[PDB]
Structures are given as structure tokens and as C-alpha cells.
Subunit: 304 residues, 6 copies
């Protein structure tokens, strides 16, 4: 099976598009699905090799049942709301996801325009986010973001559905959350206090040693080990976004995994806490305003 | 006089911020204006040479009177509304303009944050546009945008105030209009009909012959000669922007000129028309939703403030 | 496993195409050259890496094969077959060797060409030399993006490289070449929308026409072939513009690689002889083939152990 | 006044077009001259900043009188043939020169196509050369080519007409010659011998010292000093060209100068020699097959036609 | 199933070679650093991707291996063997750990070397530190192109990575380093033609000399070796220039990877001790070895699992 | 109009600083080299244009000048003035010629340095050789951005080039060099906020500390100087990192250019001796000067005319 481009080269721009399907809009949706790879080539080819344009297309749980009969991927369910003692992970509507990435925003915008043009009258936009990475891979909190992502074989093992669900091999599961930051509060901390919240040094990006790293630091709470003592990993491509005039400074989280159970265990640790950690300290400066879960099929599924 | 970076090398991203100055906010703005060049260096230096970050700061006519006590640039006035039979050019509020450009959008955003941090509580935002150039210099209508801009000595002569206003030599005047387009109407026309709207061929950007170029084309109406028969010129750096979800597809227009009279004359011809042309046909697919005029002083003028 | 030649190459903006016949008694000099071509490619290109992106793919003709080697023949190796259609004809012309040379810069291509021809002087006669350049936005001489639908990755490998079906020649491929001359005057007299109907795609945006409007005699519809099982039969193209302004020669050099010549020959038959629903490919109304040959490009290790 | 792009940044591709004007062709040519700066911006603007497309247009002595009335540039005359004891600098026909330069040949070709599309039926082609520099600024003989070109204000002084001819300030004079090389004879020398021909080291491009540099080396003959002992300089943008099947290996010479007499003095020294040199030894491996002289007017001159 | 280290790196223009010995009692501090070195690679390099191309290959010497680890040793690991030739000698010099650090820029190499050596203060003693730089056209200090005949792709894998023959260390390699200093005065006293006869390729164009003119004592003749079956034996080199103008030190840092040190050893034996037809490699009359050490570079999983 | 040397260079990522003394009887050989160095720059640089940006600025010391030249001398040319503070000391060390060689890559620098030294062998003795490298974000070894408030354009020319105040030497400049080593262990035990109070700017964002919080003994405070007429007295710096990881040597090579050494001297006096409000520059609590030399860099034509 040929996968969609979940395993993309690094990109500096992105458009995230989340829509719901209107009643009656199912067949227009299906026709787009069968053409989305053709559109990707059409927009991207003339801008190569620097463009790096790709599109990953996801389908939510409730949408799947409307669109397709027969077998359902084994881990597809709606996003699970988490109501912690202090912080909460909200669940918000979404039926399709377009994750569009490139080296420049104009290529993302071009592709989005063609997709949205084909769907007009068949869907309702829920969220549109134009992301940009800082030139040194830093996020809105000023920390490098992406450093521990798996690469090569480890990435394929972590991200791609295999023989555990054969009919859907080559697919993946995407979780999105739009965060908005309290920048005023964050900038009132010392750099050393920010370090203790994330778990790594700010300027040099070196992990804090195990003797100094807090139990409630981000890196601590999202480090998860499986039965066999192996690291359970996800692949993230978080993107900064914002608006200077409305004081909107955000991180657009997106995490890919082979099963949602990994990502969901991480979110439970962050929002609900553990015996040794009340919650992820990053959430004292970060509020989630969306939350959705999708299955991103194999490319050959969409073609048929 | 050292100008601000009006004559920038080509850039693929911009932010345009327009703000009004609240009652009492004047001292806070003066302090910021004296620091703006220092912030552009702080944000941009460590990204050289590929970052190409620059900020041009512009001040409106009403703001000028509140901020500065002495002489006024000769050409500085409120943007003049134009009510034609069909199309209107609106005047909207704007005291200060920050026109931020770079090779990437994050550098523009960093500078925009530092500026707005210094101005919080003293200004109200009126407009914020994130722009992005297409990879072949095309605008939202599919046409190459910028080809006939002046270059080198010719552009310096068209854009920068000189002897005519010598206390303000080294400044320029900028006109800003945000235009939204009707893209479904546009794409219903045949390529050849689009070529009659603009005045140039779509794929190869070659100007149409004088034998075929309609009088109400955009290229006809915006070409002006002076008394002596020499061409009057402006420098533009129009930027696409928009939102696919809301079907907003736009051009942010910005023109710089040594005097407003040249840009005003062009606007007059587009909206009000001529003996042979009712109006610029590009306006049958473009609506103006903002309209403001700004003087962009010499860089030393800003440094020497309090 | 056999090592292919660089049939599957990264994009290149320049090429040279060299087609020669082997003179009587020149067999031995050609064999020696074959054994060193890969070493010449390295010697010219290695110091210009990684931006140079120099490669050469060598092919051999049906009659030449039997002159050079003894033992087995590749299964699909045969002379280019002439196509005499009611209107358009595909000519067969002589050619014993093909050098298909690619790089980011024409001077690298010329340097390698110089070395190869240096070694073959007096043993071969030139038939065709074309120096190709692609336009900055992947357009061809007709002003359409060209190469959009080529296969990539693993599908490219399955479509082009010989496998188990002919195990002695696994890792090889078949090249068909055709030099075409365009009537650019006729072409440039069509509207864009009518050009879109000849090719089967949008010109500016390169989006394929939908199935309810795509003509049966467009290029894309005729070169779209399904097999027995209903698999799309695919080829890999690297078409290159060429020409001379002074002699009015505006051309497309066609080259297509395929695991078996049958696929390329079925497309040619549909172009030239037509189907029940299409008399011929409308592209031929603006395009005339002046050369035509068929070559086998063996695995690189076959040429080495020569 | 605004000069044409004579002073170009380095480009790796070029197209040289030389044509003659047919009977009744003048009107069509004048209309194109008025348009060629607009055409350059039309082809080039959308491929900026990497494209570096420029067109310099040149007019020959005979053509000037057919196209324009009134003043002539003071230095404009037909190319002067030089019949040396061994080597000959030939004169051939040309009314108009288009010198087209870019980072890639497709851009050069697109411009050329539009210019010639406008001139079709008015003009006859004399020469068309597509040129390519090697990736390390080397020419067909294997040497670095362009090292001692002047730069900056020194180039401007050497190349652009000024006060001496104020009606034509901002323009320049271009001499073109196409050279074919005998590569097999060149590759027969050792490197040391080739260095003696040129006047510089082959790999490092360091000039041979005055005591070792032969009097008949290329660098020695083309190094001229004025009355006051100042150096007379030209700007060159030589380009390799060829065809492997016909065994054609070429340099296209093009030199610009504020007066033709500098370039002509250098040609004299090369083909006729001096007291201590019979001729330029580069000529023992290089044969001139065209020669023409052109004036390249200020760009405003053409725009105003 | 094993993941190798980055032995097969893309081309890099900067390097740092660090060789250290492990002090008495430093074993535990070393093992902890070995388990983190891949993490430190990401820490330094991630934020400069994708153009940074930062990597670190870590190797371990024979004596060191027994001090650090209990259980099996890699089959070919032993100390560098000194070669005492009639004229030329290849010395063995102490070395327990190699860090071969490559990137597109020297700052990334230096930052990573800083972090590694910071963790190892107190536990190791430096023996050598070289800062390598590319000449821009892949030349070495002798002015010849250096790298041309290196294997690529599949051939490279097979030549470099330990396989089924030593399954516990699959994904490993063996590295041989020698720092050479050149007599540049002597070399530049040669004609280019004489320099060509030393190396066995043309200087300017890098084309290999024909088999009937290439001397038997030429560098290329003596490092060309065939196996029992007749097949070539290959190694992967990434030789780097280094130097100090004031002290007249002009050098080549030789580094050569192979799946077994027998291949590299056979090349060295042929260079230093000669054959029946060649006394020694002529390159050594202008090149003196001042270090020599052998290391095993384990699979990446081996280190992390520590 | 006298042509300056390339004091005002574009940004470069690599440098070699070469400081020599002239041996007894070497004057003639140095005079000949000085007259050819601009030719050597062209020869080495040209074939790497346009990315190479290779330049060499040649400096002559006070004692050397008197040895090489007769007649008038630059008005400001003296040996470096040793500074003996209560705590910290600026040393003076020998140096007759400075070569400041810059480029986008180290190989160009090294090849030019090799041509220069080759011509001078026998005539001069080396005193210092430093190979610098920039960090990808313009940072120094203390972790701060380094060069931000350097003058640019017309301001830079006015600051660095000699003019009508010494017209026989118009187009020259003065260069002061000091090699600094940093105690990084001591620096790294400060908090980020504490490091920011030493320098005078924020570490991550490079924004100037406000006038209400900037310490009197911070770097930026002490090196900000105003003239009688209220004008800012500016120098042009191109400080470069260097080091050796094995030796734990981590350095900044300081070089500053100005039209009179009185400007550079005033800033050194404030650092090492202090003011009324500050004992010394706190940056010297982590930085030790180990060289100190002053040179005059004549106009280009001065050097050619020899
Ligand atoms: C709320 C906004 C978020 C921000 C700004 C943020 C930023 C960071 C940064 C700076 C790191 C360390 C560098 C790196 O390895 O990338 C990190 C690590 C990580 N975060 Fe986040 N992150 C956010 C949310 C999330 C969420 C919601 C999840 C998971 C569901 C997640 C999972 C991870 C994981 C697994 C790692 C790597 C831990 C390791 O070293 O193994 N993060 N993130
Ligand atoms: C409404 C959105 C606008 C769009 C999409 C737009 C687009 C264009 C395009 C495509 C061209 C041709 C290529 C070139 O740039 O030279 C152009 C030319 C021009 N436009 Fe606009 N334009 C707009 C508004 C205006 C306005 C409001 C003015 C003046 C106030 C203006 C002044 C000009 C000028 C002066 C020219 C060059 C004409 C020439 O001298 O050949 N534009 N415009
Ligand atoms: C006059 C010569 C030619 C020109 C200028 C030309 C141009 C084009 C263009 C513009 C496309 C559409 C974009 C693309 O997918 O690359 C196309 C597609 C194609 N052409 Fe041609 N072509 C020519 C000759 C040939 C010939 C001789 C063949 C085959 C024997 C060929 C086979 C194809 C195929 C198979 C495709 C892809 C169809 C699809 O699956 O979408 N073409 N070519
Ligand atoms: C015949 C084909 C020609 C070739 C292959 C050629 C090649 C070269 C080369 C390699 C150099 C040395 C590097 C440099 O550019 O500075 C050079 C220098 C020069 N060439 Fe040519 N040249 C040719 C014809 C001519 C002609 C016809 C002229 C003038 C009429 C000329 C004038 C010069 C000048 C003035 C220099 C610079 C000398 C100096 O001041 O050092 N060349 N040529
Ligand atoms: C003084 C140190 C060295 C210098 C400057 C040097 C330089 C060269 C050069 C210029 C080439 C020809 C182009 C190419 O890389 O293929 C060459 C080839 C080669 N060198 Fe070295 N080398 C050195 C040491 C070594 C040593 C110590 C060995 C082996 C232990 C070695 C093995 C090779 C091999 C195998 C080739 C490939 C030959 C072939 O198959 O064509 N070299 N080297």
C-alpha cells in the first residue's frame, strides 16, 4: 500500500482546513476524494523541486459511516473530551481534515482554493489556520519544536497502520488541537522557570537531566513506554499561527500515530495528571479551543 | 537624507498594520517612532542575509497634527473619497501604517509583535493583512503584478521627495486600499476577455498592441503623461491575501509617489473615468473596502524624535 | 540485484540528445566506449556535485545489438515501426546508439558529450544532435506544463524497469524517441480554451479537464491506456524544448521509457491511427515527427562487464 | 541618461543574434526598437530574481543612416578588416545585434522568439549563437575567462560614452567576432606551453610574472597603456559555443568600450603584431569567421523612437 | 532491522575529527555519553535542518572495546598494524574513541564537539583534533579531484556495512584514519604531466589515464584491487583538507570505511610495501603519515541500548 | 577619487586573520607583495563569483610604516596603547602587517592566504593566525548576537574612512585587533538574566535593555559614546568566533575599524579603566585579551602605485 504523505520533508508553511459535510453533500465529497491526489500534482508540479507541496486528507468517525459501507478502521472513534480538575480538552465538530504543507504559503493557498472550489455547497468550514514556522524551528513559546520526532524506520513503525488491521494498512490517525497561549504570563517567567515547564534548555535544546527534570514538565508527561520497555512515539508537526491586533498567539498541534491509543494516553497524562504530577505545566500557559480525531487512509483507498 | 526602505528588493511576504491613536496615547507613539529602526535591526540582523526584513512607517494627516508641532509636508491631506456613477473609493480611518516585508512571514510577525507590544493601550487596530506573493509574481486574478514598476534612478526620481519640499526630502507618500475580488464573475470570462480588462496578455505578460488595447483597460487608464509628455510613475507592491473558508480573495494595493497628486490622478481616472472610458473595468470585479494616505518620513526624521 | 542506469533522474533543465549509427568495422571501438561510459559520467560530473546532476543513459538499437553482442536478445527489442495513418505518419529513421544526457547546466552536458564523441571518432556517423532546455515553470514549446502525470517512486520502478519477465535483462528499459517540429503560428492562433481542448488540461493551472468535457481526441484522453486487468499502463517522459529562432524551428524532443515497448506503441497507435471515437490526436494537427527510433537501455552492470 | 544593461552581473547563458535589414524593413525595425525594453521586462519580470535576463541592442554604421536622421555617433564606422602576414580578421554583414544574457538559456530563447517574431519579413539572419559558460568560469580552451575585466566605476569609465560625444552619452561600442578552435592542436601542448600562450596559470589563474610572460602571450598583447601611462580597458563577456557532431568548438568574443579605438588597437596588436611579437599566439589555435562593429545607444534613445 | 550510523552521509563541506584516549576510571562516564550521543546530535542539528546535514559517527578502538564491554567482540577488530616499508612507514598512534562530525557548516560541527567533550571532561585525554574544509570543486591539497571513484547506492552499502557474516554486529563498519602532511614545495616542482603519472588521472578534467599509459606505481593502480572471484574490492573515503599557512602545514585527513579492515589493509600493504612491479605508491614521496588508528563504528541501536 | 580597500564588505561567514612581523631586510619583498595583493584577490576569487565574496584588507603598523616608507605619515598612526587597569589589562603585542581575509567559505580565504605567504616566505615571521567561523545566527561564543548596532550605508562610510582631516591619506582607515579568550565555565554559571545585565541586551531576541534597567557597567553602556556636538561616535566591527575543543579554548577575535583611533581608544579606556559610574566593563570578567595591535589600512590606489 502507498501511504499519503504523512512522512513529509520539513515545511515552513501550512494550511489546516477542518470542515463538516452538509446533508446531501456525500457524493460531491466522494468525487473530490478520488481526485485529491491529482489536484496535488496539478498545483505542485510546476513549482518543484523547491515547493514541497503535499496534502494529507482525514475522515472523522461519524463522517465515515455516512460515506462508506463495509469495514471500519479498528481505532476510529470521535475525539474523547477530557475534563480534568483544572484544565479541559474540548471536543469540537469536524468531518474532514486537509493538512496542506509546502515551503511557501501561496502553494498551500492555491491547493486549498481548488479543493474548497470543488466542495462549495457540500460542506461548512469549521476551522481555517495558516501556519508559519519561525526560521529556527521555534514555536510561539520560543522553544525548538519537533526535535524528538522519530525518523526513517522508527517513523514508519510509529505512524503507519500494518498487519494488525490489514484492510487499512498504510493509513494513520491524526489528532488536532488548536491552542492559544498566554504570552504575557509566560514572558514573566525566568528562562530557567520556562525550562522547568518544557523539560529542555531554551537556547541549546538539550534535554534536562533526569535528576533535575520535573515530574510535571511537558517532556516528562509525554514520555510513555510500552510493555516491552520500548518508547511509544508519535509524529508531530506543530505550527505557530496568530494575529497581532487581536492578541492571538497560538500553536496548532497535530499528532500522527498508528493507533489513537498512544496519543490518547499522552493527553490523559497532560490533562488529568498522574500520582506524581497534577497536570502538564504547559497547560498553565496554553488553552485548547478545538479537538478532533481523523483517519488518514492509504492513497490507494482514496483512488478507488 | 537617508530614506526608509521604500525601494526594497523583491519580497514574498508582508504584514500591513493600520492603527488609530487613542486619546492620550501620543507620547507613547513618539517614543515608539524613535525606536522603530532599532527594533527592525534587532529582529532582522540575526536572520541576514536571506531574511530581507524591512519596516516602512507612515503617518496620516490628522495624526501628524497631534504628534508634531511645526511644519507639515506640503502634500499631506486626508484620503479623498471618490464617488463615481458606478464605483466608489472609500476613506477609512488610519493614523499609523506599518508596512512590514521580508522573505518569510514569521520575520514580519516577530517585528509586528514587538511594535504592537510597545503600543498596547495607546492605539486601536483598524486593519491587519497577512500577504503572500505567488511564485511567478502573479496576483489573485492570474496576471503578473509589478512588471512596469520603475527601477534604479527612475524609481528614486518617482518616489522620493526632493527640492520641492526640502525639510521633508527623503520622504514619500503611500496610498493603501484593500480590494476584494469577485472571483466567480472573473473566471466566467474567457482568457481573451480578461486580457481586454487588464491590457496585457495573461500567460506571457506582453502588452497588447495599441491597435487592440481598449481605452477602459487597466493599463490604459493608469498610464498618464505630464505636461512635457514624460510618463508619470508610481511604485507599487501589491500583495494577495485571503481566506478560503469565507471566500475572501483580495489584493492589498500600496502605491508610493513623490507627491500624492500622481496617485490621486490615476484613482480619478479609474473611478470617475475619461472622455472615452466610463471607468476602469478592473473595478467591475474589484471592490475597495479601505482607503488611506500616509506620509513616510526620512529615517533620520524618526530617529531625531521624542 | 542489477543496477539500472539513471533512467529515473531528478528534474533537469538541460539535456543533450545524441543519436549515431555505427560505421562498418567500428564494432570494437564502440564496445570499449560502452565499458567506460559510466566512468566518464563520474569524471565529468563528480566535481560539479551536488548541483550539477549530470547523468547519461545509453541505448542500443535492434540491428546494432546483433552486430555487437552474441547470445541472448532483449525480448521487446525490434526496429521502430512506421505508422502510416490516413492523415499523420510516424516515420522510422536510422539510429544504432542513443546518449541521453541530462544536467542542471548545458555546459556539463556538452563536456560529457565531447568526451564520448572523442572516443568514437571515425567509428560512428552522427544522425541527430539536439540541445534541449526546459522553461522555468516546467512548460514546453506549446506553453503547457509538461511532465505532471509521470509516475514517481515505486510505480515509476514497476512501469519502467524490466524484471522477471526477461531475467537476463532485468534492470533495463526501452526508450522511444521522436523529434517533433511545431507550427507555432497555427498554435498561437487558437484561443486558450481551444488549446485546453487539444491537450486535455487547463493551461494556467494545469488541472485536468473533467471527464464530461474532455474531448475524445485530446492528447491526454488518447494516451490514457488501461490493460487487460484494468491497470493504467504508464510511461516515464522527459520531453525537452529545442529550436533556432533564425530558421523558425520550434520543437519538442519526445523521449519515453517503458518496461516493454508495447505500452508506448499502443499510445502511438492511438495517436496516429485513431480509435472508434477519435480520428487522431489533435496535438498532431500542430506537430510533425521528423525522426523516430527504438532503443534498449541495458542495466549499468551489463555495460561494465563488457 | 540611462544606459542599457551593458554592465551586467555574471550570466551563464547567452544568445547572440545578428541580422541585416531587408529593403523596406526600416519602419518595422524602428517600431521594434521602441519596444525592446518593454519586451525584456515582459519575459523577465516573472522569473526574477534568479533569471537575470537582459538584452543589449546594437546598430551598425550603414543601418544608422537608413534608420535615423541627424547626428551620428562620432566613433561609428564599419568593422575594419586586418589582413596580417599569417592571420586575418574578417569583416562580415550585420545591421543589428541582439546580445541576450540570462541564468538559463530558455529565458534567452523566449526573448529572442518575441524579438524575431516582430521582425519577421523585415530582416535576414546572419548569425545565431547559443552560448554556455562552464561552471567554473572557464572558456573552451580550459582557462578562467573574465578575471581582469574592470568593475564598478572603473568599468563605467571604460565602457560608457560621456562628455566627448554628449548627444550620445550613456551608450557604448561593441565589437563581435566568432572564433573556431582547433582543439586537437591545443590539447597537444602541455599545460606549461598553454600557460605561455595565455599569460596566466591554468589551474590557479595567477598572472605569470613580467620576466616570464612571453611577449607574444595573449595577456601581453592585449595589455595597452594610454599616452599618460594609464591602462586602456575593455569589458568582455566571451562565451563558449559548439556542436559535437560537426566538431565545432567556439569562442564568441564580444567587447564593449567607450570608443572603438581601444578595441581596434588591441586587435591590431593581435593580428599584425609589434616589434617583439609576430602575432598573438592564441590565433595559432583560433580562427575568426565573423567580425562586426555596433553602437549600443542609451536606453532612453530607443524608448523615444 | 539494525539501523546503521550515518556512515553513508550526503556530501558535506565541513568536518571535525576528534580522537581521544580514555583515562583510568573514565569507563562509566564514556558509556553514559555513548548512550546519549544520538540525542545530542538531534539537539544541536534539528533546528538547522534541512540544510545543516549534521551527523556524528562514533568509533571504538580494539583495546578500548574490552575495557568498555563484556561479551563478544566484532570479528575484525584489532589495533592498527604498523607497516615498516623500505622507504615509507605507516605509523600506529593511540586512539580509543573517534568522533567523525560532518555538516554543511563548521559551526554545527563545533557546537556538537563542544557538547560531547563537555560531558567527557575528566574521563578522556585528546590525542588529535582536525578541522576539515572542502575546496569548492572537491579538490585536495594536491589539486586533484578527491572522491570520484567512491561507490554509491547499493554498491556502497555492500562495500561498507557488516552483514550476515558477523550477525551480532550487523549494521557496523570499520574505519581507518591517517593524518597526512604534504611536501607542497616538492609537488609544485613537478610538471602537471608528472603529477598525473603519480595519481593516474588527468588533473584538470579528472579523466582516468588509459591502462597502457597509467604507471604501475600510480596511486590509482595500487589502490585498485580485485578479489579471488575477480570482482573489485571497494572502500568509501571522505578525505578532508586541513592546514595552517603560518606553520606551512598542508594536509589530507584520510578516512576510509569498509565492511572488513582486510580490504583497507590490503590497499595499505600495496601502497607502503609495494608489489613485484611497483616499489611503493608514488603519492607517498610527497605525503607523510603522522597518525594511524583503526576503529569499529557500531550500529546506532547498539549505542542507544547501552 | 581614492578607492578604499574593502573595509565595508558584505556579510561573510568565514575569515582568516594573519598577523606577521617583517624580518630585518624583508622590506623590499614586502613592498612588491603589497603592490600585487589586489591582483591576487582577483585571481583567487574570480572563478568563485558571485557567491564567494572574497576580499583582503591589508594593514600596516606604525613601526613598519617608518621602515617601508619615507615622507608624511597618517596623523593617527602610533603603536597600540597598553592599558593598565586596577583589575584588567589590555596588552600590546608585536605586529607589522595585518591581512584580514573574508569570504563565504574558508577555502577561498585559505587559498588567498597561501598565495600571500608564499610570496613573503623568508621576509616575515608569523605572530598570529586565526581561522574564524560565524554561527548560523550571527552569535558569538557567549551566546549573544554580535554586530547588530554596526553602522550601515552612508553612516558607515562617514565613521570608518579618513577624509579632509588628513587629506594625503583619504580613503584609509585604522584597524584595532585584539584576540580574546573566554572563561566559559564561569559565564555558564550565570543565569540568562544575569548574562543580559553584563551585555546590555536580551539574549534570545537581541532587543536593547530599557534605559531604566540597563546597568552602568554593561557592555553596551560603556561602548556607547557621544561627541561634544551630541553626535554618536561609531566604529565598524566584524568580530569572529574561533576555538579548539580539545584545548578548551573558546574565543572572540575582535576587529574594529574607524576613521581615527581616538574613537576606538575612548571605548577601550571606558572598558578597561572605567568611568565615574562603572569600575570596568563586566564583559572583561569573562574575557581576557591576549593580543593587541593597531594598523593603518591605506586606500587601494596607495598600494597599487608602489
Ligand atoms: C499545547 C501546545 C504544545 C506545544 C507548544 C508543545 C511544544 C513541545 C516542545 C517544545 C517539545 C520539545 C521538543 C520536541 O521534542 O519537539 C515537545 C515535545 C513533545 N510534545 Fe509537545 N507541545 C504541545 C502539545 C503537545 C501535545 C498536546 C502532545 C501530545 C498529545 C505533545 C506531545 C509531545 C511529545 C511526545 C514530545 C516529545 C517528548 C520526548 O522527548 O519524547 N505536545 N512539545
Ligand atoms: C484593484 C486591484 C489592482 C490590481 C489587481 C491591479 C493589477 C495590475 C496589473 C496586473 C497590472 C499590470 C502589470 C504591471 O504591474 O505593470 C497593473 C498595472 C498598473 N497598475 Fe494596477 N491593479 C490594481 C489597482 C491599481 C490602483 C488602485 C492603481 C493606482 C492608483 C494602480 C496602478 C497601476 C499602474 C500605474 C500600472 C502600470 C501601468 C503601466 O504604466 O503600464 N493599480 N495593475
Ligand atoms: C508532440 C509531442 C508532445 C508534446 C508537446 C506533449 C505534451 C504533453 C503534455 C502537455 C501533457 C500533459 C501534462 C503531462 O502529464 O505531462 C502530456 C501528457 C502525456 N503525453 Fe504527451 N506530449 C507529446 C508527445 C507525446 C507522445 C509521442 C506520447 C506517447 C507515445 C506522449 C504521451 C503522453 C502521456 C502518456 C501523457 C500522460 C497522459 C495522462 O495519463 O494524464 N506524448 N504530454
Ligand atoms: C580568441 C578568442 C579569445 C579567447 C579564448 C580569449 C581568452 C582570454 C583569456 C583566458 C584571458 C585571461 C583572463 C581574463 O579574462 O582576464 C583573456 C584576457 C583578455 N583578453 Fe582575451 N580572448 C580572446 C580574444 C580576445 C580578443 C579578440 C580581445 C580583444 C580585441 C581580447 C582581449 C582580452 C583582454 C583585454 C584581456 C585582459 C588582459 C589583461 O589586462 O590582463 N581577447 N582572454
Ligand atoms: C595522501 C593521502 C591521500 C590522497 C591525497 C589521496 C588522493 C586520491 C585521489 C586524488 C584519487 C583519485 C580520484 C578518486 O578519489 O577516485 C584517489 C583515489 C583513491 N584512493 Fe586515495 N588518497 C590518499 C590516501 C589513500 C589511502 C591511504 C588509501 C587506502 C588505504 C586510498 C585509497 C584510494 C582508492 C581506493 C582510490 C580509488 C581508486 C580507484 O578504484 O579508482 N587513498 N585518492
Amino acid at each position: 500500500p502507498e501511504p499519503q504523505m504523512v512522512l513529509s520533508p520539513l515545511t515552513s508553511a501550512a494550511i489546516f482546513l477542518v470542515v463538516t459535510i452538509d446533508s446531501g453533500g456525500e457524493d460531491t465529497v466522494r468525487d473530490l476524494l478520488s481526485d485529491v491526489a491529482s489536484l496535488e500534482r496539478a498545483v505542485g508540479f510546476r513549482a518543484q523541486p523547491d515547493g514541497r507541496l503535499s496534502c494529507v486528507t482525514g475522515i472523522g468517525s461519524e463522517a465515515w459511516d455516512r460515506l462508506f459501507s463495509g469495514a471500519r478502521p479498528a481505532g476510529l472513534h470521535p475525539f474523547r473530551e477530557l475534563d480534568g480538575p483544572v484544565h479541559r480538552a474540548v471536543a469540537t465538530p469536524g468531518d474532514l481534515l486537509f493538512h496542506i504543507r509546502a515551503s511557501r504559503l501561496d502553494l498551500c493557498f492555491a491547493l486549498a482554493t481548488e479543493i474548497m472550489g470543488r466542495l462549495r455547497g457540500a460542506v461548512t468550514p469549521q476551522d481555517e489556520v495558516h501556519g508559519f514556522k519561525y526560521f529556527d524551528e521555534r514555536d510561539m513559546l520560543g522553544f525548538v519544536d519537533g526535535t524528538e520526532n522519530p525518523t526513517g524506520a522508527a517513523a514508519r513503525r510509529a505512524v503507519l497502520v500494518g498487519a494488525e488491521d490489514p484492510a487499512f494498512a498504510g493509513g494513520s490517525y491524526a489528532v488536532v488541537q488548536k491552542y492559544l497561549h498566554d504570552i504575557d504570563a509566560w514572558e514573566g517567567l525566568s528562562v530557567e522557570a520556562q525550562e522547568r515547564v518544557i523539560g529542555r534548555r531554551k537556547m541549546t535544546d538539550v534535554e534536562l537531566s533526569d535528576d533535575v527534570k520535573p515530574a510535571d514538565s511537558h517532556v516528562a508527561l509525554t514520555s510513555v513506554t510500552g510493555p516491552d520497555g520500548s518508547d511509544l512515539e508519535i509524529l508531530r508537526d506543530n505550527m505557530p499561527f496568530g494575529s497581532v491586533g487581536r492578541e492571538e498567539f497560538g500553536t496548532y498541534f497535530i499528532g500522527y500515530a498508528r493507533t489513537p491509543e498512544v496519543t490518547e494516553t499522552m493527553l490523559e497524562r497532560m490533562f488529568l495528571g498522574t500520582a506524581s504530577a497534577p497536570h502538564d505545566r504547559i497547560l498553565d500557559f496554553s488553552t485548547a479551543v478545538t479537538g478532533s480525531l481523523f483517519f488518514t487512509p492509504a492513497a490507494d483507498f482514496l483512488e478507488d
